[PDB]
Symmetry: none
Subunit: 143 residues, 12 copies
């Protein structure tokens, strides 16, 4: 029962691990971007695209995790335990959720092929020694 979340879209887990861990933006910025730029289509009762369903499921799962964190914060009495578990969850599941949200938002707003090639380009650029590499890191743009 090894189900790969990105298998049906053309990507794969270790392909998304090519990029460094510090590259991805925080969760709050991604949620704000999704709410500000895609709120009307998400809440409509329509089958828009396969990306929308995954985005809705991810947002709901994040909400449930935050609710559980709030409950353990309120009810549990041990301070060492409360901070330990909160830091653990926030630092160990946030990375994968950031990866998922960034991938889906970028695919929605830029295109699948561009996002597919950008990963390879950025990884190859990072691996090259500085002296024989272009000085400007690649970026995603629409202007």
């Amino acid at each position: 029962m090894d189900i790969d979340p990105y298998k049906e879209f053309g990507a794969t887990v270790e392909l998304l691990s090519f990029l460094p861990s510090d590259f991805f933006p925080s969760v709050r910025d991604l949620l704000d971007t999704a709410s500000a730029l895609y709120r009307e289509a998400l809440e409509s009762p329509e089958h828009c695209s396969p990306h929308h369903t995954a985005l809705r499921q991810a947002i709901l799962c994040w909400g449930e995790l935050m609710t559980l964190a709030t409950w353990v914060g309120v009810n549990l009495e041990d301070p060492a335990s409360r901070d330990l578990v909160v830091s653990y969850v926030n630092t160990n599941m946030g990375l994968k959720f950031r990866q998922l949200l960034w991938f889906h938002i970028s695919c929605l707003t830029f295109g699948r092929e561009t996002v597919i090639e950008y990963l390879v380009s950025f990884g190859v650029w990072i691996r090259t020694p500085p002296a024989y590499r272009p000085p400007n890191a690649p970026i995603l743009s629409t202007l």
Copy 2:
């Protein structure tokens, strides 16, 4: 900010609240029936239907929650914290997953319209006072 999971499939949360809390099976039975009936299509890289994506996401989320549960079980030193955490995650959080899995598996197995009509039929049956309730409750099947 108020995404409703069932809106795109024709239902709502309130409509699905006709069934009582004890009606749904356990998580284990749903997982084994999902593995037994629909496993080759889940693994294949194809956009088969909107139900498959939701099922995959739900299974992954349940796996992540179970991983967190075993982490806290093996790391926490205070037994009270461990037992309270596992009781919470098993009781209060499992009902939504049971509802989601039941809905998505039944829709694949029998059809969406049949489940939609079954919901209102069961609501009508359950709202009747006990003195005039017929003994047989509605059930889902495809054979006479």
Copy 3:
């Protein structure tokens, strides 16, 4: 001034009294069913069907009665009087409100002819000796 609420729909008050009083579900279940199944159509600005208008009027009337009961319970000081008036509001008018709500909801979801015939079928079934009667009471489904 003997207007009959059910006359224009093909029914009649004494016909709806054929069924026993305990048969009807409570008010809360009917209100939740109406909210869950027909909330989009009730609030839309259109003349959908003659049933929608009656349903809207009944809902608003029940809301006004509940508000009056709440004010009576709060502002009044006599415990016996408030208890008695609350008992009156939630027993006497409750029966007719339940009958009206059940009739309109069932007609909306199942059909007029089916609801018309079901009353006769159940009324005949109730008053037959058990030894010479089918063992399962009729029900509305699908």
Copy 4:
């Protein structure tokens, strides 16, 4: 959960609030004119118009409220409580019931569009400061 009775008829609750509270006639006069002009059509078993259904429901509700008032008057032993509840019902539900009856009777008698334009014109007239207000207010008539 927020059904508006006038929404389906092309009106709105706050639009009807242009007229002051003292403008509406009493309940008795409305009942007598309704009986005088439209008794035969009200009793007939026909879906004549959407106004007739609303009028019938309003009349039945008023009858039920009056029966409740008679019951509390005859049963309760403390005269102060009976006086208080009678005053409350007559000074609270009266306004709404007179509004509904007046709107529905006038719509049948003269026409819905005429009533709407009359409401707009009366609002314009009443909003004017007294020093520049013409002496005669608008009225509904066919002569």
Copy 5:
């Protein structure tokens, strides 16, 4: 002067004597069923069918009997005689009225041929000794 009230319809008093005593519902239930199923026809000025005339005469006569029972209960003195006469008029005269009302209402609702065949098929079932008789009695419906 042997006047059989059933011959003109097709039946016979001997044919209806096979039914058990408890097969029939109460007279009040039959009256309520008759009123709630067809009250406009029983009050319209039209010779609708031969069943309607018999129904009207039976209803009027039962009303007369109830008036007589009330009078004897009110005006008599010895309590014992009161109990005897009331019980007699309630049971012995009431059984025949229950039978007649059931016959006419069923003939109106289902049809004459169906009820005739139902009586014929019920007779053989009731005549069989219990040892070889299947437990389930015949059921009359559509």
Copy 6:
């Protein structure tokens, strides 16, 4: 409870109130006239006319009530109560049966329109004051 026995045939209860109570003949005379005139028609297996069904029902009901009277006379032992019961059933109840039998037999013999016209004429005769009342009363006959 508003069923009218004579209303199918064009008559009405208050229409038959014109005739005084003493006008009607006796039960034995009506029954023996019916037996002598329409025995073969009443005993046939056919519904020739609506009057036949009513006549049959009335005759069987009268037989039932006579059986009841015999039963109470035989069984009851209290003299006063027994005589009161028998006198009541003989006198108070038999008037309506006399009316019904007279109406149906006369209709069958002569004609419904003739019966109605006779009722109207007898009403006029009974309303006329005694001073100018003809010494002979209207009668039903053909030759």
Copy 7:
């Protein structure tokens, strides 16, 4: 001198002996059902079918036997002779008239072939050992 009463009707005495002795109803019920259903045809001067002649002869014979019974009851002075004769007439001389009346009424009201097949089926039903015997027994009727 060995005339079989059922021979001309496609049956035999031994074939009709499948049914037990207690299966048949009483004489009274048969007489009232015969009067209720077939009376105008019995009185009419027409030989409608061979069954009517046999029914008329059987009724007349039973009437003659009852007349003999009442005569011997009212004339003989010894009570023992009277009650012995009455018991004999009622018990040892009924089992044949009941059989004849049942056969002839059933043949008219349902049909001869149906009665024959019913006898054949009742034989196999009654010969089965009780352990494997189904609960309900075959019956004659026309409605479903």
Copy 8:
């Protein structure tokens, strides 16, 4: 329930009483004639004629009466009542059985119309005074 045995065949009971009582031959001769002249047709499984069915039924009933007489003669202990009942049956059922057997056998062998006319002819002949009457009584021949 007054069923006349001869009505279907064109005669009545009163017509058969026109002849005197002593005219009819005894039962033994009629039984022997039936056995000797009609045994093959009586015992065959076929619908021959309406006379055959009546003849079979009469023969079987007479046999049943005879065995009843044998049983009462054997078992019952009082000789007086024994001979009394035997004489009673032999003297009162024998007459009607003789009439029935003679009528059916004669109709079978000679013809129905001939027997019907012969009854009237013999009755009229018997009633006439001897001096103005033919001296030879009628008889059936060939």
Copy 9:
């Protein structure tokens, strides 16, 4: 010399042993059924069907066996010996004779295919747990 009596008719001894031993009716009932239902055909001098010959042979065999039992009972002196031999004759071989008679009679009266399928149906019904089985056993009827 392994001749099987049922082999030519489409069955075997093993198939007829599928049913339980108590199922078969007694020999007397089968003999009376055969006498009452098929006596005219059995004694006729004609070749009707292969079932008739087997039935005749079986009946004659049973008659001969009964005669032998009667002679043994009559002309023997030891009560134990006669008791044991009649017990043996009535028990051991009566079972197979009952099976043969029942099979032939049922095949004659109902048909070969129906009897063939009924054995399988009854065996499968018998060998099923009660909770998941139709409530009542099958039977042969309607003919």
Copy 10:
């Protein structure tokens, strides 16, 4: 009742009584010739002829009787009873079974009409007084 085994084959029990009791061979010789000449057709599942069914039934019955005799021999403790029953069966059933086997085997081998004519001729020969009886008795054969 009175079933005659030979009636359906064109013969009669008293017609076959012309031959004396000593004419028939033993059971063993008949069994050996039946096995030698017709074993293959007896075992096959075919309705070859009416004679085969009768032969199979007779062989099965003889086997059952021999099994009963063996059981009586092994069981009974009194030798007198064993001797009496064995003598009775061997001297009583042997005649009938030899008659049946001889008739059926001869009919199969030679033909039914030939057997009937042989019976008639042998009866005529045996009825003649011995004074002028020809010496050679008739026999069944095919070669000149």
Copy 11:
């Protein structure tokens, strides 16, 4: 090396795990049913169907296990150990053989599509908690 014995036919191990243990008949009855329904096919030299093969290997292996049980019952010394091994081999090894034999015999008798749908419906029925399920289980007979 996860060789699933049911995958090639269309089923799966976890699909058949829902049936309760009491649902299966005994192994002796299954063997008798297999022998009586079809013995010629199990002994003919032909590759009739994939079910016949698995039936043949299962039948041989059960006899192997029975021989093992007889040997251990005979040659062992301690009675307790004998009881343990015999009970183990009859129950825990026998359940799987009962399941496999039932599956193959039913697939031969009724078909494959019908048995697959029956398994699906039975699973749906059994997963429901008792309070809301109909009291009668599904039945497979045609």
Copy 12:
């Protein structure tokens, strides 16, 4: 009970008795060969050949027996009975599983007629007296 395992494929138990018992290799070698050569075919959802079904059944049965042996070894406490049981299950029943595995694997690899001819030739080689027996035994090979 007369079912022959190899009879569908043309062989016979008597035919396989030519080879001595010691000829067959151990179970582990055959299982290793089957895993290394036919791993993907046994796990596929298809019945390619009748040999595959028999191979799958045999492997599952051997796994069952190994589980039984482990169970009795773990649970039983008596040393003598335990060792007797494990020795029996290892030695006595393993021979027939070895035979089945050898037959089916060889038929899958080299063909069937080749196996039958090899059986016949090995029988001929064994029947020869030792004086004239060639020193090399027959073998199954292709190159």
